Design a protein around this ligand. Sequence first.
Ligand SMILES: *CCC(=O)[C@H](Cc1ccccc1)NC(=O)[C@H](CC(C)C)NC(=O)COc1cccc(OC)c1
Ligand SMILES: *CCC(=O)[C@H](Cc1ccccc1)NC(=O)[C@H](CC(C)C)NC(=O)COc1cccc(OC)c1
Ligand SMILES: [Cl-]
Ligand SMILES: [Cl-]
Ligand code: NA
Ligand code: NA
Lengths: 305, 305
Amino acid sequence: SGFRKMAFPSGKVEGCMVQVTCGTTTLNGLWLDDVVYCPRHVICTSEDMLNPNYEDLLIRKSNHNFLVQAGNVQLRVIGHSMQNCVLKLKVDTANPKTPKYKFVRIQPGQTFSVLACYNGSPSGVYQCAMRPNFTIKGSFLNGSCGSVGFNIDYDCVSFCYMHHMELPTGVHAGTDLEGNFYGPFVDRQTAQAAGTDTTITVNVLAWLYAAVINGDRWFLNRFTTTLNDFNLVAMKYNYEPLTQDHVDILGPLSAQTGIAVLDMCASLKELLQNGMNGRTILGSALLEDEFTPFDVVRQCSGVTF
Amino acid sequence: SGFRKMAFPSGKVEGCMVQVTCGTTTLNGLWLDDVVYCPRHVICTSEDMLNPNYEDLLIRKSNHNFLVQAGNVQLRVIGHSMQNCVLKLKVDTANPKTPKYKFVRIQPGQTFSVLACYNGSPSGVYQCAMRPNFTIKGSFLNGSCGSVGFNIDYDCVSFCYMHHMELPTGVHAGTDLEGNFYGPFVDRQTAQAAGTDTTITVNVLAWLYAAVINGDRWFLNRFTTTLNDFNLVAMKYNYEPLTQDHVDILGPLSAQTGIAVLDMCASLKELLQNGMNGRTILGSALLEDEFTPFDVVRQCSGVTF
Ligand SMILES: *CCC(=O)[C@H](Cc1ccccc1)NC(=O)[C@H](CC(C)C)NC(=O)COc1cccc(OC)c1
Ligand SMILES: *CCC(=O)[C@H](Cc1ccccc1)NC(=O)[C@H](CC(C)C)NC(=O)COc1cccc(OC)c1
Ligand SMILES: [Cl-]
Ligand SMILES: [Cl-]
Ligand code: NA
Ligand code: NA
């Protein structure tokens, strides 16, 4: 029993993190096979970031201008390519620690584990969620660029994120491993705005099941609601709308508790309309929305790797 | 910027986790050099756990009763030992992935990273804190026994915890790597109570510094308090007393913020007496106490490993 902000084991990813240096900028890269992936602004100066032309800047670069180092091994760049906003550097050695991997593009609401590194070496791991506005609320200091977020499927590492920027508001933005940004953001140091963040309602419902599984059950009530009735109260509170697909996905948790999904929705409706009245659920006085339903199944069903 | 519940990268520890089977019981073990460390109740049946005689049971056990498996490879037990509550099994092979390590016994209030494994396979990682009552509030399903907690110091893994049991209240208890239980607990299935839990005040003050570093500054006040004045208000709210040794430890954070330690104590005193009044600190409506001052410095400095 117990519920914790838990992240996938990061060992597999740790063997893929290299230090990439171009000019005076040093950031992190992801070494998979004989290719290193790093955020393409490695090539920019502090003055270039304000309005960068990356095709002109990369033309001025050469293979010997990129210094890639995996621990004690200095890899040699034998090629450089720019796919969208990521720079792929071809290297003369292949990472023997390359895991079975796949590049995926996650959706808003999905969560992932972030291996935050600085100058190529892992510093920590924590669980994040792709916010509905395609930002994330992580912890990234200068040099954490090229830190990647991922999920593991038994033995297959699904790389889903690479960090690029902290927006002026403090929220973070990044790309998939093919270089396409999550959200309306650009790798240019100009004021950029993120959309109004909304609450992932299906993840709140997932968290409330984890709460019932653990012994907090004061919030349960004998009523049942409709998806539409709930969604009018939810939309008012900047809460995401619940579809039939969310109800289907919550099926497994409903099954192990015997609490129908529209039965828990009625409990979530009273919480939003009446607050928690100074009570806590799983120890929190607020409603957590960064646990997918799959996260709850994992933490209360094992799921090893 | 950003502040997250972050855990040390678990790759190093992953290379030490093995599956240990004695009889019908199968749990996790820690493979360091030619010794596997596992919880000594591996030798117990559910009928033995209710009142176990570990000296009587171990007599009936021999080296061939223990089945240790590192993935696909069967390690061969050539010796078995019982130190306090841990079973040290000698094996015919030494772990080639052994990190430079040390067994440490942490204090209440110190934090560590937990690698939760099941059946020998790492499943997840999260950051915990030794509660003042010598419990920890993690996430452990049956089979999680022998999971280890740790901190990393550059390249040296400091193993500080091994999980043994979940108490009836839902909180968790375990040992150091020498088998000595943290707290007043015994490895027997009988109702056992933990002492009254208190709030680690030094970790709240550390966390409030993490908040100011990040932009949360509504709680700051022009007033300053005395250590005695503060400790009289805190004890009433079941907050641990803050000593001059704690103030010394918070020094680095005071230097980086320009906010004296007793200046922050004055902000904490109003928070205890007046609550948060619909404000959040780093996104929370409650006061977090599971971040040590070294954790805050680590997350706001970039310490790698
Ligand atoms: C790994 C961090 C960086 O290298 C990154 C470069 C960068 C790219 C694009 C826009 C701005 C900077 N810097 C970065 O994100 C910093 C990190 C802070 C911890 C200092 N953030 C800022 O500089 C914030 O200011 C800012 C101003 C205007 C635009 C913008 O992003 C759109 C950020
Ligand atoms: C890895 C988990 C175990 O193997 C462990 C064995 C054990 C040791 C000591 C006392 C009791 C059990 N079991 C364990 O802790 C379970 C785990 C739950 C996820 C089922 N917890 C309980 O059985 C809780 O009940 C309990 C009753 C009486 C005493 C006691 O601990 C003192 C726990
Ligand atoms: Cl593409
Ligand atoms: Cl022997
Ligand atoms: Na209900
Ligand atoms: Na003050």
